[PDB]
Amino acid sequence: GSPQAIKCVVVGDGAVGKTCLLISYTTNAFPGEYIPTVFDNYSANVMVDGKPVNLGLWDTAGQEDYDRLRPLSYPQTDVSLICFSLVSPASFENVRAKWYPEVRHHCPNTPIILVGTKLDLRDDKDTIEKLKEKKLTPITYPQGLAMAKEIGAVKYLECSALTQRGLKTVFDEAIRAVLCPPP
Numbered sequence: 001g002s003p004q005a006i007k008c009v010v011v012g013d014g015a016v017g018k019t020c021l022l023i024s025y026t027t028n029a030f031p032g033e034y035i036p037t038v039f040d041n042y043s044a045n046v047m048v049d050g051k052p053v054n055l056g057l058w059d060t061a062g063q064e065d066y067d068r069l070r071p072l073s074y075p076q077t078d079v080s081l082i083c084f085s086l087v088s089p090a091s092f093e094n095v096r097a098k099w100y101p102e103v104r105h106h107c108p109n110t111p112i113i114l115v116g117t118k119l120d121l122r123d124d125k126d127t128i129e130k131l132k133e134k135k136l137t138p139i140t141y142p143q144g145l146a147m148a149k150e151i152g153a154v155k156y157l158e159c160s161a162l163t164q165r166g167l168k169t170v171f172d173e174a175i176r177a178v179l180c181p182p183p
């Protein structure tokens with residue numbers, strides 16, 4: 001047959017690491033240094049569970065200024081990654097306050113993966129200490145999983161675009177959430 005075409009849209013607050021996640025996955029290199037994007041397209045031709053897939057990846061802008069344009073990326077979405085940074089509690093709460101409602105509205109009845117980004121920073125002695133000074137604490141795995149279940153996500157996954165810990169898994173699971181498994 002042909003590789004199954006699967007459209008995956010990536011959303012979440014500005015600076016949670018959406019573009020880095022995509023560039024790290026598709027090229028194996030982490031981009032130079034930060035810079036907001038305005039809807040870039042990426043792709044991956046891969047095997048998952050013995051099936052070839054053409055994964056089309058749609059990056060989106062997290063900033064509020066791009067709210068009116070973001071919806072143009074949603075038609076025909078097969079799976080959505082809702083991203084939050086593990087070291088930004090606000091970005092976590094925005095999963096329920098903003099991103100889930102937006103995705104559910106524009107992409108009803110398609111799978112969602114919840115992605116906790118910047119896993120390397122949850123492990124950063126410094127970063128922790130620094131969050132502490134601000135009365136913040138990183139989001140834990142159980143906390144993340146609970147958000148996932150609240151929003152009906154098929155999976156909760158944690159990763160670092162920088163170290164690539166758990167990176168491949170995010171995309172294999174986004175594809176698995178779409179494919180029809182064996183009998």
Ligand SMILES: Nc1nc2c(ncn2[C@@H]2O[C@H](COP(=O)(O)OP(=O)(O)NP(=O)(O)O)[C@@H](O)[C@H]2O)c(=O)[nH]1
Pocket residue numbers: 012013014015016017018019020021033034035036037038060061062063117118119120121159160161162163
């Ligand atoms: N430590 C660390 N930093 C990361 C990781 N991923 C992205 N970052 C950093 O976080 C910042 C934002 O990343 P970026 O991918 O541009 O975020 P975005 O979600 O695409 N922002 P926007 O919605 O504005 O386009 C950059 O400084 C980038 O280096 C990570 O896995 N670990």
Ligand SMILES: [Mg+2]
Pocket residue numbers: 018019020035036037038059060061
């Ligand atoms: Mg970006």
